[PDB]
């Protein structure tokens with residue numbers, strides 16, 4: 001049955017919590033235990049209050065995200081289809097209580113410095129249920145790194161890492177991410193020169209450029225095992241297909257066109273659509289500390305531009321990884 005918050009966030013861990021992100025879903029905090037940072041995602045469930053302007057999910061509605069988190073985390077320890085490019089899942093708990101005052105303090109600090117679009121989560125009663133997901137800390141999102149990357153060479157490593165992770169998940173799980181906006185691509189420093197993956201038993205490497213990429217946020221994702229499909233049915237959602245002002249919002253429409261509004265089906269072209277949106281961000285919105293000033297950098301730019309104009313003619317991330325010249 002549900003545990004108190006203190007089960008997940010013993011005092012010292014709660015005292016070290018800093019807010020790092022948010023969405024309509026709820027709140028994300030960073031903390032530390034056994035000298036290791038972790039990210040804690042907290043989602044209210046089962047209650048009647050609007051939270052951030054939206055109804056709370058039921059436990060049945062939140063289960064897909066929990067299941068998908070686990071399956072993608074487990075890919076780091078598999079053999080035939082192996083990738084560390086998702087995000088590690090450490091634990092999941094169902095908690096009952098009002099929001100901890102120490103988390104309110106962290107929430108207020110973020111509101112003061114960065115500003116929040118959410119409600120201050122101070123209105124929950126002591127019977128409120130939450131899902132608390134503890135993840136590996138994955139670094140900083142690509143959107144927050146808009147002005148922080150070295151060069152377009154780094155962009156190439158990032159797109160290769162994303163494409164490989166998505167391909168491995170296609171092959172093992174018939175996975176579609178379905179919401180891979182640039183807030184959901186995390187970057188962390190690595191001392192490894194090369195990152196390793198295995199796709200259908202064939203192992204390969206990717207030069208890191210000093211960064212390891214982690215894909216997060218499985219709210220809209222789909223996968224299947226042995227014919228049992230886990231997904232978010234958005235066929236009757238209005239608002240998801242009516243956004244404007246960013247190619248992101250076109251991707252939701254383009255996915256609905258590809259799948260004829262049947263969200264249980266497998267359409268791995270959606271992963272190609274998201275990779276095209278990310279490549280577009282790399283070329284149009286990211287700005288690098290070092291431009292392509294030399295001939296050999298102008299070449300990497302030309303190859304990423306060629307990827308942008310050709311990739312929509314590939315059927316899946318697997319097709320892109322295996323056949324696109326960018327990755328040869």
Ligand code: NA
Pocket residue numbers: 084085086087088213214215
């Ligand atoms: Na990862």
